[PDB]
Design a protein around this motif. Sequence first.
Motif, short mmCIF file in Angstrom:
data_model
loop_
_atom_site.label_atom_id
_atom_site.label_comp_id
_atom_site.label_asym_id
_atom_site.label_seq_id
_atom_site.Cartn_x
_atom_site.Cartn_y
_atom_site.Cartn_z
N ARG A 25 0.82 -1.21 0.00
CA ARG A 25 0.00 0.00 0.00
C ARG A 25 0.87 1.28 0.00
O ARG A 25 0.52 2.25 -0.68
N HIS A 28 2.32 1.66 -3.40
CA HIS A 28 1.21 2.19 -4.22
C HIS A 28 1.13 3.72 -4.10
O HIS A 28 1.09 4.41 -5.11
N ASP A 58 -4.34 7.41 -0.05
CA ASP A 58 -4.69 6.14 0.62
C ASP A 58 -4.14 6.06 2.04
O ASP A 58 -4.05 4.97 2.61
N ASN A 87 -14.12 1.22 1.31
CA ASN A 87 -14.04 1.71 -0.07
C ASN A 87 -14.47 3.15 -0.25
O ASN A 87 -13.73 3.95 -0.82
N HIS A 90 -12.46 5.59 3.11
CA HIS A 90 -11.02 5.89 3.24
C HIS A 90 -10.66 7.26 2.62
O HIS A 90 -9.86 8.01 3.18
N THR A 117 -11.88 7.97 -4.92
CA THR A 117 -12.50 6.64 -5.16
C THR A 117 -13.77 6.77 -6.01
O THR A 117 -13.94 6.04 -6.99
N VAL A 118 -14.63 7.71 -5.63
CA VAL A 118 -15.99 7.85 -6.18
C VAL A 118 -16.16 8.97 -7.22
O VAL A 118 -17.16 8.99 -7.95
N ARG A 140 0.71 -0.85 -10.83
CA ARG A 140 -0.53 -1.53 -11.23
C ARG A 140 -0.29 -2.37 -12.47
O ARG A 140 0.46 -1.97 -13.35
N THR A 167 -15.01 0.67 -13.50
CA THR A 167 -15.37 0.49 -12.10
C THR A 167 -16.84 0.11 -11.95
O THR A 167 -17.16 -0.86 -11.26
N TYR A 170 -17.40 -3.47 -13.39
CA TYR A 170 -16.88 -4.48 -12.46
C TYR A 170 -17.73 -4.62 -11.19
O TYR A 170 -17.97 -5.75 -10.76
N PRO A 177 -22.78 -3.18 -4.16
CA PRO A 177 -23.47 -1.89 -4.20
C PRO A 177 -22.60 -0.80 -4.84
O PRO A 177 -21.37 -0.85 -4.73
N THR A 182 -20.67 7.76 -7.41
CA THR A 182 -19.95 7.11 -8.52
C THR A 182 -20.75 7.22 -9.81
O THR A 182 -20.18 7.48 -10.88
O1 LIG Z 1 -19.01 3.12 -5.64
C1 LIG Z 1 -17.96 2.46 -5.44
C2 LIG Z 1 -17.95 1.41 -4.51
C3 LIG Z 1 -16.76 0.69 -4.31
N1 LIG Z 1 -15.63 1.00 -5.01
C4 LIG Z 1 -14.38 0.21 -4.78
O2 LIG Z 1 -13.42 0.84 -3.92
C5 LIG Z 1 -12.17 0.14 -4.05
C6 LIG Z 1 -10.98 1.06 -3.83
O3 LIG Z 1 -10.95 2.10 -4.81
P1 LIG Z 1 -9.77 3.21 -4.91
O4 LIG Z 1 -9.96 3.93 -6.24
O5 LIG Z 1 -9.85 4.05 -3.66
O6 LIG Z 1 -8.40 2.30 -5.02
P2 LIG Z 1 -7.35 1.69 -3.90
O7 LIG Z 1 -7.57 2.41 -2.57
O8 LIG Z 1 -7.65 0.19 -3.84
O9 LIG Z 1 -5.99 1.99 -4.53
C7 LIG Z 1 -12.18 -0.55 -5.42
O10 LIG Z 1 -12.07 -1.96 -5.19
C8 LIG Z 1 -13.53 -0.13 -6.01
O11 LIG Z 1 -14.15 -1.09 -6.88
C9 LIG Z 1 -15.68 2.08 -5.95
O12 LIG Z 1 -14.68 2.42 -6.62
N2 LIG Z 1 -16.83 2.76 -6.12
#
Ligand SMILES: O=c1ccn([C@@H]2O[C@H](COP(=O)(O)OP(=O)(O)O)[C@@H](O)[C@H]2O)c(=O)[nH]1
Lengths: 194, 194
Positions: A25, A28, A58, A87, A90, A117-118, A140, A167, A170, A177, A182
């Motif tokens: 992490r 990353h 992160d 998810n 964070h 993330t969203v 990645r 996203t 997937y 959910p 998003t």
């Molecule tokens: O509405 C949503 C619900 C869940 N996730 C998930 O949140 C996780 C972490 O996303 P991020 O982009 O924060 O990447 P990471 O912290 O894993 O590098 C991924 O597995 C996504 O599929 C998302 O992106 N959108």
Amino acid sequence: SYQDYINCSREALLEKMAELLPEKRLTHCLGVERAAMELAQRFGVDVEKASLAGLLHDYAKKLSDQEFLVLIDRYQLDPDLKNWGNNVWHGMVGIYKIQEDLDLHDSEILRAIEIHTVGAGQMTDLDKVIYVADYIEHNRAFPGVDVAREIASLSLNKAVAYETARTVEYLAHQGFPIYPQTLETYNAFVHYLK
Amino acid sequence: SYQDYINCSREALLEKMAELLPEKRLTHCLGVERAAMELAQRFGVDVEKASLAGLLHDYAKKLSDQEFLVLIDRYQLDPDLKNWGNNVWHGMVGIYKIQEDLDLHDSEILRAIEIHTVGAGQMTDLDKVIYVADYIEHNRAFPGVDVAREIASLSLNKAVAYETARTVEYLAHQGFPIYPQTLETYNAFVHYLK
Ligand SMILES: O=c1ccn([C@@H]2O[C@H](COP(=O)(O)OP(=O)(O)O)[C@@H](O)[C@H]2O)c(=O)[nH]1
Ligand SMILES: O=c1ccn([C@@H]2O[C@H](COP(=O)(O)OP(=O)(O)O)[C@@H](O)[C@H]2O)c(=O)[nH]1
Ligand SMILES: [Fe+3]
Ligand SMILES: [Fe+3]
Ligand SMILES: [Fe+3]
Ligand SMILES: [Fe+3]
């Protein structure tokens, strides 16, 4: 310098983060710091704000559900947040842990972390750089990362669109959910794939 | 009888619909009528309301964009509807064409037609029967229809969940906008896949 925004040096921050995060992490976060700087240069975003937000995005990945729930109440966040998990949390809630730990007050950096993330229906170029850098950083290797990389070399908006589509696709494939914000991002950006 | 709900016999309606729809679309409506009746028997829904709503669900499939736009204004529907197209309109707005042409006033039937494409977070059993019957009717042959059929033989709620997941997944795969009410349906039902 990073001390222009937070209460310690980059080196001190890295030491702090090595405590908080598993090696993978942290690696990353380092990759995202680098990728954010490159994107910021390409698309006219402050390289320093981009690098710092990239490194920090992160930071709060390993907080427990209990901690996030504390933060939602204390900061009086949207009550709906309790229905979700790590998810969403964070970034959306984790920004408060960042503020507490590091004295980060810059609103642009905080926002780019918040929605990494969203996304949102409206994103600053800095928000977009972080959202995309997270996805394309050199560590990645997911199938299709090469396509994301090529897109991001040409268009920030199309890179946001491609990542968001992938996203949503997937999450539906998996039967997870989907945070409504998003979808706001998806619908705002999807036209860029054309 | 169907005249208990509309201003003509089933036979007269079929003649009317043969004018409005290509053969394949009419055959589809006939298949949905049949599938709705079967599901209604399995899950304790009025077989007659189900059959009629099933037959009528795609009545307005061939209206032009111009007609739907007229209907949005006249009936003073949500202005956001203009940003969408046929896919959303043929049910959500098309119910008004049905009311005009056939004197359909039953609120349960009207609602089941209204949300047949997009669903809602809250759906009556009748709404669910129509939403699922559309997807599993005997003329459909898309890969995975067999799975949908098996699911629907056991659980209306899980069939709604499976269909909605597949729809969201495919729209994202294709890079098409997703009607926000579709996501309301998705998030409400997705737990049933577990
Ligand atoms: O509405 C949503 C619900 C869940 N996730 C998930 O949140 C996780 C972490 O996303 P991020 O982009 O924060 O990447 P990471 O912290 O894993 O590098 C991924 O597995 C996504 O599929 C998302 O992106 N959108
Ligand atoms: O939010 C949306 C946006 C579009 N569509 C599309 O609308 C079309 C028609 O769906 P319906 O269930 O009404 O089936 P049909 O009328 O083709 O039998 C399909 O291609 C869907 O992918 C959808 O279902 N949800
Ligand atoms: Fe993240
Ligand atoms: Fe990340
Ligand atoms: Fe339809
Ligand atoms: Fe149909």
